[PDB]
Design a protein around this ligand. Structure first.
Ligand code: 49Z
Ligand code: 49Z
Ligand code: MG
Ligand code: MG
Lengths: 546, 546
């Protein structure tokens, strides 16, 4: 019967609360108990503070009024205020101290997932202090997870005035008995209770979730660790750059700070990075997630040599040039992995740092043809199957759903050995018509990939595999070099195609190479173990790229 | 007969040269004259330095070889090297010292403009030092202005080997007698002379330009001050963000650093900022140049209230949210001006700094209807003409060329008084069918605007003017506030619609307001006086926004 949940910000979705800094300051400075909270509330409905919350005056205009109020409250209680006593100081500090109460955010998230309409209703202020960006950042992180954010200072009303709750109900398109409202201030709860909303007085977070759990009938506490935030494609900024007459590259862009270019693998998409994109933005980076040449909304010219590494790389450089980026951090996976290593070797001036998931760097052997090298590894047999224009295209395009459902599987789920693929006659010859859905992917996510691959199919993606000789020759040019810019190699324990041991010699070529390793992780690193990927990439970025 | 010009980088397009740091170091440290230049050249065709220039080894790999060479050269001349003597030190310093020789760049630019194919041919290195971004930045700024950049370390050949000149000719698709080649090193000139190219030994820049001027027959020296770099639309990164179901915003994006959002006026385009975009990027900013709601590739819903300021502003905020930007600097002109002031007043947490060209901030008068206010100013008569849906649309759409040719004119060029526009019956009733081209705009530039306005015409742009009452009511909500974030107001001396004196009271609302003023500058600020605009905006950004 409950269908909507409404959260306050201070004391509920962010801790510690700013009222708490009034009280602790008093204590810390041994002033009359309550003195600062009296100054804060001075005048009530017609006092400075209400005008703030209603958006009549800015924070900075308020600061000297609160001064005046403290001066008067201390006069009447016959006490002095300390040398250098500063309300700007006290508030700057309070506001940077408050962080997101992670378990309250997680509960809000869970209820939204099961169908609730969620809202933040907060008494707040127009923030124009030199340090405002601090709060701008917090609000940004919170608001994306809610259906509505209602700000006292934007709508010109405040809790506990009754009109804001009517405005609230009217925003939810919900009747008061379909709504739970959590607040840490009981006076603000009263008018929600009068209209007959379920209310929760939030003292400690866990009790409130226990009450919230009871009353909604959904598990909220002790719930397993959730996934990272994923991307909704149609919420993204989509950018497009023509790097040369017949080729434009598409990317999705989120965040500010050092530019970080994500390069997906075969046969994938920018969306392969859907778990990393919000996390790395949040972590203070400008993420550009590409569709690599051949995929999605990027161009897919037909000719094979359009997909040799030399041409691919020159193109990524041109992409930086037209975006006006002198460098970026390049992070790749699978084929996008091989490319970033090559970007490091031929264009180190353009690469802030380089990282690869799964794909090791392995110099070309000048004494052995690349085709020999490939025949030397039973697990690469699929690549010889990929060579004949048309053959693999026909298999892979035949049933896109089945294709992505068969490839994107976790290590304990596979339906396709890479074994004697040529002999068998195809990559799917002995796998089902209608495979089950992997635990890694929802049905909607498979369908996005399917839709992307309707644009150009598999000729462009397959062409990446069809320049063995050209790439070998070009790579041979780099045999005298070492990679000496910052570099990270993440091995995936259960990738049976790019096995971790294939990376074992890499320190000969990259002496200060850094490492991560992910256990129980198959070939589709980013969606198999998103949390562990995010942690390893941010830690490395913050240490080596920042 | 000469059709191509080819420039070296070190000693020609960038000064001072890095060979000069070899010699001056020697002097500064009182070592044997030439000693460092001998170590540098040690081994010749098969020495460390050639392998660098050929791209066999990276800069960082070379550094300790050059060490070894200096050690050996000093041994043979029976002298010691100083305590802390450092080749990394010496080179880091050389490389940051070299800047673009502005007059050589300008000459290259001029020859490209008159039709030459231009190239940089340089002996250079794969740069992997911690400080490489320095050179990446220089190369970026230079290469955009040339048809080809040919790097010894990418093609695996070096001056003076004869094969690089053949590669050069083959890149230009030009015969040697159609080519002038400038170099500061005579040995490198020799093989160009053998093939019969015109060659210029560059010692001091001015003599070389004098020779270059003579031989090409084009003025290059003492030429008037050129325009800033403009944008080629199809070279830009184009981004798109859906801020709500029926509305997506288009912008062009260039550069990295603090995000700077440019908001054009009526009836304009992102392209109104074409002179500011490369300049501010170069100046170290992330420029986002919008098409504002109603224009170009942004959406243009029909309903008037879609263009009230409150809705426009909420939308710009949503644009930040979906891009993951907690703040941006907002810089507006004309209507984009009014908007940024309102962004400052209702969303100061999202605005790093605010600047307006021409548009003053003028609080709403709560005691006077906005229509009264408009009738009170003869020069705003055109705005009453704008009120009736359909009327102004029909005039403005009738002949787009004539429309933009009639509006975009410099102060000494006008063909349209704003005078009694309603009485006259239209904005163009007494101006020509086919106006001349303004000195401010080429024919191609008028045509871009024309093409943009074919998408949605003038209903959306005109609607901005059709919310006088709604904007007044909303603005009245902000009457108690002041703007206390950093703020710049640029007045245009000869803007006869937004006259400078209209800005005279602004310090009452914005006490720390900063100012610029541009003389002899009409309403179309950005294209009338691009250089002076760029200088005022960067100086203000570097001081107040950085
Ligand atoms: C540079 C590189 C060489 C080889 C690489 C691995 N490609 C595997 C793609 C793939 C293909 C088919 C099934 C699963 C699957 F994962 S990357
Ligand atoms: C907030 C604002 C109110 C008025 C403004 C001026 N608009 C002028 C546009 C324009 C229109 C017609 C001709 C020239 C011309 F420049 S901005
Ligand atoms: Mg509270
Ligand atoms: Mg030189």
């Amino acid at each position: 019967t409950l269908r909507a949940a409404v959260f306050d910000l201070d004391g509920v979705l962010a801790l510690p609360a700013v009222f708490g800094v009034l009280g602790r300051t008093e204590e810390a400075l041994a002033l009359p108990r309550g003195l600062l909270n009296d100054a804060f509330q001075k005048g009530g409905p017609e006092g400075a503070t209400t005008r703030l919350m209603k958006g009549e005056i800015t924070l900075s205009q308020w600061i000297p009024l609160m001064e005046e109020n403290c001066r008067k409250c201390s006069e009447t209680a016959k006490v002095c205020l300390p040398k250098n006593f500063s309300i700007k100081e006290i508030f700057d500090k309070a506001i940077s101290a408050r962080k997101i109460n992670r378990p309250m955010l997680q509960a809000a998230l869970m209820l939204r997932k099961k169908g609730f309409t969620t809202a933040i209703l907060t008494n707040t202020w127009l923030d124009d202090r030199a340090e405002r960006d601090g709060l701008a950042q917090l609000m940004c992180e919170l608001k994306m997870h809610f259906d509505f954010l209602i700000e006292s200072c934007q709508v010109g009303m405040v809790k506990p005035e009754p009109q804001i709750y009517k405005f609230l109900l009217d925003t939810l398109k919900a009747s008061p008995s379909e709504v739970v409202f959590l607040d840490d201030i009981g006076a603000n709860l009263k008018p929600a209770r009068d209209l007959g909303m379920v209310t929760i007085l939030v003292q400690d977070t866990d009790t409130a979730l226990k009450e919230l759990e009871k009353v909604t009938g959904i598990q909220l506490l002790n719930t397993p660790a959730p996934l990272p935030t994923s991307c909704n494609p149609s919420d993204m900024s989509h950018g497009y750059v023509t790097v040369k007459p017949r080729v434009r590259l598409h990317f999705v862009e989120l965040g500010s700070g050092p530019a970080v270019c994500l390069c997906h693998g075969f046969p994938e998409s920018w969306y392969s990075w859907r778990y990393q994109i919000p996390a790395l933005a949040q972590a203070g980076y400008r993420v550009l997630a590409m569709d690599m040449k051949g995929y999605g909304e990027s161009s897919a010219p037909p000719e094979i040599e359009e997909y040799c590494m030399e041409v691919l790389c020159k193109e990524m450089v041109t992409f930086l040039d037209k975006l006006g980026l002198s460098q970026a951090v390049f992070i790749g996976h699978d084929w996008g992995g091989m490319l970033v290593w090559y970007m490091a070797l031929f264009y180190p001036e353009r690469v802030r740092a380089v990282a690869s998931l799964n794909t090791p760097f392995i110099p070309a052997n000048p004494n052995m043809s690349p085709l020999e090298s490939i025949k030397a590894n039973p697990v690469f047999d699929y690549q010889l199957y990929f060579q004949e224009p048309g053959v693999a295209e026909a298999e892979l395009e035949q049933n896109l759903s089945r294709t992505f459902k068969s490839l994107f599987r976790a290590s304990d789920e596979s339906v396709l050995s890479m074994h004697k693929v040529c002999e068998a006659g195809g990559l799917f010859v002995n796998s089902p018509e209608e495979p089950s859905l992997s635990r890694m992917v929802t049905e909607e996510e498979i369908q996005f990939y399917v839709q992307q691959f309707k644009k150009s199919g598999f000729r462009g993606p397959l062409n990446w595999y069809r320049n063995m000789e050209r790439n070998w020759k070009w790579a041979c040019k780099s045999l005298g070099r070492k990679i000496l810019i910052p570099a990270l190699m993440v091995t995936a324990e259960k990738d049976f195609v790019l096995v971790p041991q294939m990376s074992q010699h890499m320190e000969d070529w990259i002496p200060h190479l850094k490492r991560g390793h992910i256990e129980d992780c198959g070939h589709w690193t980013q969606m198999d173990k998103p949390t562990e990927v995010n942690q390893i990439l941010i830690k490395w970025l913050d240490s080596d790229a920042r």
